[PDB]
């Protein structure tokens, strides 16, 4: 009739969309997008811990399932949010189950920042439910001894999963109730008070002496060892203690008075005497040690009116040797129970309400994979530039191959006439005029936009002051430049981004004013083109030696080596690995993700073949350029001239210069302009974002 439950525990309740929804801000961008599901579920929780665990509740089953259900949401959600947790700040408190336990340091109530410190509690209240649903239960209906049976063992399992997660998960030493010791003592009690049952059953179906004996006795030996667990340790409600004394004891005297029946039919009749007289004395204790815990008057006429019929037959009947009890037999010991393990879910009809979001040791290497990507991409990039600017920076301080399309010093040579023809139809100078004029334009736009974005926070806060320092404080709230933290932070950063940027620019019209004379010269059409360059009587081993020809075909090998640079560019741009399901794959698999392993060998391996390519470009030229140096070294001497031709040459190469100085301007402003007009547009947020914040007030 008396069975151990335990109390549940109470806790504060704490606005859980409010530190939750703020990832999401982190998460997604948009309104209308994925980011307004997220949200009716941060609510939902918000409603579901309140109806859980808000309340002392109506020990039913909905009240467990709800418990369950929470405990479920609560685990489905940290590998999403809390990994590092780095600001997110929710912060849990919870008050122990049984006050009087540490007079010494931190008592009654814990603060925590840590989910599993959490979940724990949690599991605690649900585990510390299901002994008081199990408890209430009629024990004679046979429906009612299942449900019994199933939530101790439950219990027992709850708790000793808690033994087994909290000094390993928390961040500190943990309250009375949940540290190892105390926990594992009561999932030993559940688990005995389950085996009590089994042994109420066999009971009923009136089974085997013998197998009522050993399953009364295992139930014992439950209640023994848990005690044992107690004795000297101050874990510790207080009418626990005598109960587990008290119910040992009388486990002990049924397994006593069960096999007395046995050794009775084997007619061992001093045994039968020895073990009642055994289990009479357990109860004589029992009824008057532990009266008001527990009534046992019936068992101990069972026993007196057993022993006076035994005691009866032996004294005229049998005559048979009474031993004394350290002469008999263990009696044996069977259980039937085990601590139901924790696996998620334990809540009946789930539905993890976050089941669509993408985990954060995903979401964070997903990341860090797109700088890896960045990275090879813009740094392959970068060497394919500077090796191809600095070869056509070759050929044209060596005349090239300005030199050798020179039949006669009439016209102008086909390279440069194919360059010219480019320049001109591609806008001309006017292009480069265009772009030269308009970006200080589209430099000042923009600092326009920024000083009247600040100036209306420097204008707010001017009024906030004058407030207060005129007002009988009904104006109290936010000192307005304290508000005006972050926006200026970024304010400050947009400007030295600005000054870089304009400093930047100058250095290119200077360039350009240096460079554009000889421009002016390739937007002309062929007649004035060709009377501007000075004509020279040319030189006439160019008919065809080994000298010149080897060099042709040098510069038509190193023509489609820097030809196909684009192509690279273009497929080095062009593709994308969505990494996602690869990781997933992995987190499932495997415990967590070590990205570098992963992604390293997946990068030179979706990339791979290019890298290598890209090194067959750079190295290739290396070779092309030093078998042109020691080349034209040999063609200096068999083309000569005094000054008719040291003006023609001087001119060729001014004007290959022009040429690459053109195309090097104008993939470089377009460029330029493509980035200013993405800065227009990432400061209209900004502008309207300060606008938002003094209308905020």
């Not at 620019?505 to 200077?510: A, C, N, P, S, W």
Request: hydrophobic content about 40%.
């Amino acid at each position: 009739a008396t069975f151990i439950s335990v109390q549940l525990k109470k806790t504060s309740e704490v606005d859980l969309a409010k530190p939750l929804v703020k990832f999401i801000q982190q998460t997604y961008p948009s309104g209308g997008e994925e980011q307004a599901q997220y949200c009716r579920a941060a609510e939902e929780l918000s409603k579901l811990r309140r109806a859980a665990v808000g309340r002392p509740l109506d020990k039913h089953e909905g009240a467990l399932e709800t418990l369950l259900r929470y405990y479920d949401q609560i685990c489905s959600i940290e590998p999403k949010f809390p990994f590092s947790e780095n600001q997110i700040c929710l912060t849990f408190t919870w008050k122990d189950a049984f006050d009087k336990g540490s007079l010494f340091g931190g008592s009654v109530k814990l603060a925590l920042a840590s989910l599993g410190y959490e979940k724990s509690c949690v599991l605690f209240n649900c585990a510390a439910l299901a002994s008081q649903i199990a408890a209430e239960q009629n024990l004679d209906n046979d429906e009612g001894l299942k449900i019994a049976a199933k939530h101790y063992q439950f219990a027992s399992g709850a708790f000793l999963h808690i033994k087994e997660t909290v000094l390993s998960a928390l961040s500190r030493e943990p309250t009375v109730d949940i540290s190892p010791d105390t926990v594992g003592t009561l999932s030993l009690i559940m688990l005995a008070q389950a085996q009590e049952v089994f042994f109420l059953k066999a009971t009923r179906d009136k089974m085997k002496d013998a197998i009522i004996a050993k399953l009364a006795n295992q139930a014992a030996d439950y209640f023994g060892d848990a005690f044992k667990q107690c004795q000297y340790k101050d874990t510790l409600p207080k009418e626990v203690f005598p109960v587990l004394a008290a119910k040992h004891c009388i486990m002990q005297a049924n397994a006593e008075y069960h096999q007395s029946i046995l050794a009775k039919q084997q007619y061992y009749f001093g045994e039968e005497i020895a073990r009642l007289q055994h289990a009479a004395e357990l109860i004589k204790t029992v009824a008057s040690r532990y009266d008001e815990y527990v009534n046992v008057k019936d068992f101990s006429d069972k026993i007196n009116r057993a022993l006076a019929a035994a005691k009866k037959d032996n004294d005229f009947i049998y005559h048979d040797r009474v031993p004394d009890l350290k002469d008999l037999d263990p009696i044996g010991k069977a259980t039937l129970v085990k601590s139901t393990p924790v696996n998620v879910p334990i809540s009946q009809k789930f539905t993890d309400l976050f089941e669509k979001m993408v985990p954060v040791s995903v979401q964070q290497s997903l990341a860090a994979y797109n700088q890896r990507k960045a990275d090879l991409v813009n740094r392959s990039i970068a060497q394919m530039r500077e090796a191809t600017t600095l070869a056509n920076g070759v050929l044209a301080s060596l005349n090239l191959p300005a030199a050798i399309e020179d039949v006669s010093g009439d016209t102008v040579p086909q390279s440069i006439l194919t360059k010219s023809r480019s320049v001109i139809e591609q806008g001309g100078i006017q292009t480069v005029d265009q772009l030269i004029k308009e970006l200080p334009e589209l430099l000042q736009r923009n600092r326009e936009i920024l000083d009247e974005s600040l100036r209306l926070l420097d204008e707010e806060e001017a009024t906030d002051n004058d407030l207060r320092a005129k007002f009988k404080e009904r104006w109290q709230r936010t000192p307005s430049n304290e508000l005006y933290k972050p926006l200026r932070a970024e304010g400050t950063n947009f400007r030295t981004v600005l000054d870089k940027a304009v400093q930047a620019d100058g250095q290119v019209k200077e360039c350009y004013q240096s460079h554009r004379d000889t421009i002016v010269l390739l937007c002309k059409p062929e007649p004035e083109l060709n009377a501007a360059i000075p004509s020279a009587n040319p030189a006439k081993t160019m008919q065809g030696s080994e000298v010149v020809n080897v060099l042709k075909s040098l510069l038509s090998n190193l023509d489609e080596v820097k030809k196909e640079r684009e192509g690279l560019e273009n497929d080095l741009k062009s593709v994308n690995f969505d990494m996602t399901s690869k990781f997933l794959t992995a987190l499932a698999q495997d415990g967590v993700i070590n990205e570098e392993a992963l992604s390293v060998t997946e990068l030179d391996r979706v990339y791979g073949g290019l890298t290598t390519k890209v090194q067959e470009s750079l190295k290739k030229q290396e070779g092309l350029l030093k078998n042109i140096q020691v080349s034209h070294q040999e063609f200096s001497k068999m083309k000569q001239s005094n000054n008719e031709a040291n003006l023609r040459e001087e001119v060729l190469k001014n004007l290959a210069t022009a040429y690459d100085n053109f195309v090097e301007l104008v993939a470089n402003l377009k460029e330029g302009t493509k980035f200013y007009n993405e800065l227009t547009e990432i400061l209209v947020r900004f502008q309207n974002k300060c606008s938002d914040i003094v209308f905020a007030r």
